[PDB]
Amino acid sequence: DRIDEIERAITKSRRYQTVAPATVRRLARAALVAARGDVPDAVKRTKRGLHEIYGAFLPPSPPNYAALLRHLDSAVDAGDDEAVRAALLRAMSVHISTRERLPHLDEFYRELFRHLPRPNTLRDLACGLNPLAAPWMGLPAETVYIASDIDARLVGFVDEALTRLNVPHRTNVADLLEDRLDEPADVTLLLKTLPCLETQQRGSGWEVIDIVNSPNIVVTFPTKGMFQNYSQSFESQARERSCRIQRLEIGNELIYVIQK
Ligand SMILES: Nc1ncnc2c1ncn2[C@@H]1O[C@H](CSCC[C@H](N)C(=O)O)[C@@H](O)[C@H]1O
């Protein structure tokens, strides 16, 4: 019952009302045991935990997605590609992490896909608002975009955006530390996610990379001794598994293209 109680408080009007029930329950269980059974403290622990992995990237209250979609529609309707891209850039900027890549979006994907095969199915885990980029990805017309994150409204908005861009897609609310990763996908994107997973569960980072059913994985780390920290640990861990990888650095992002 104590977990249900915590969750009820975590339906946290504003910030965490639509976070994946699976994520709330996982955090609440760890928080309860760590809080010595004190629900009030368990609630604070969970809330704080949610801010670390989710809340920190988004607004104090849910973003105004309706307005973001409205602008998207006007552009798509007016058949103005410039307007569509402008509306997409504006939307993606609501998510703090995704916002950091916008200045290097074209270089980022132009280069990234030169090191990848032409995908039939692109999976974007802990996607943030990244899927809204794509017109920049030069994806094959038939490519199916599979995106997921930890918030239903964010993911639900990613779905509407992809629908307006007429991009074949499927979207789900999935927690990388529990949900399945066996669905086949030619390429999987794990952009600026590992650090967050490691914080939630030590070692989870590479456990995900290993089980993800994709022969091609792109793992990135934010750069803004952050580059040193991330490049050293990841690279030692890779050479420790004889993983074939190609390193790149675009904008404030350290990129690793993993094959097999
Ligand atoms: N356990 C978990 N499972 C899936 N996504 C998670 C997660 N914990 C955190 N996230 C998500 O991790 C993302 C990190 S920020 C990076 C967002 C996006 N990948 C981009 O590159 O721009 C957030 O969107 C957050 O909601």
Curated annotation (Swiss-Prot):
Its EC number is 2.1.1.179. Induction: Regulates its expression by binding to its own mRNA. Changing D175A: Loss of S-adenosyl-L-methionine binding. It catalyses: guanosine(1405) in 16S rRNA + S-adenosyl-L-methionine = N(7)-methylguanosine(1405) in 16S rRNA + S-adenosyl-L-homocysteine. Gene3D superfamilies: DNA helicase RuvA subunit, C-terminal domain, Vaccinia Virus protein VP39. S-adenosyl-L-methionine binds at H95, I96, S97, T98, R99, E100, R101, A126, D149, D175, L176, L191, Q200. The keyword tRNA-binding does not apply. InterPro entries: rRNA_MeTrfase, rRNA_MeTrfase_GmN_bac, SAM-dependent_MTases_sf. GO terms for biological process: response to antibiotic. One of its GO terms (molecular function) is rRNA methyltransferase activity. Keywords: Antibiotic resistance, Methyltransferase, rRNA processing, S-adenosyl-L-methionine, Transferase. Specifically methylates the N(7) position of guanine 1405 in 16S rRNA. Confers resistance to various aminoglycosides, including gentamicin, kanamycin and sisomicin. Protects M.zionensis, which is an antibiotic-producing bacterium, against self-intoxication. Belongs to the methyltransferase superfamily. Aminoglycoside resistance family. This is 16S rRNA (guanine(1405)-N(7))-methyltransferase. The gene is sgm.
